[PDB]
User: Fold Tumor necrosis factor receptor superfamily member 16 from Rattus norvegicus.
Amino acid sequence: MTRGTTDNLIPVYCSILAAVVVGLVAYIAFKRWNSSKQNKQ
Amino acid sequence: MTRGTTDNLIPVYCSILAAVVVGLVAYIAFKRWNSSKQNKQ
Assistant:
């Protein structure tokens, strides 16, 4: 619940990283699925 | 480069977490876009 009682701060790397990762995969996944084919992943 | 010579170990929480997060958002995003509408995000 407290997670180190940092209240959004300490976990800056895991937060910024996870964000870029999620969004990134979404930008490519949502784009590739927008119309692009798979052709053997 | 070595990061403790553990080769993917310490960052088990950030790894497992980021994974579930990314995939999750993808399962909902890829599903909602599969046909579901937005109607004001």
Summary: Chain B has one helix and no strands. Chain B has one domain: 1-41. Chain B touches chain A at residues 13-14, 17-18, 21-22, 25-26, 29-30, 33 (CB under 8 Å). The CA atoms of residues 27 and 39 of chain B lie 19 Å apart.
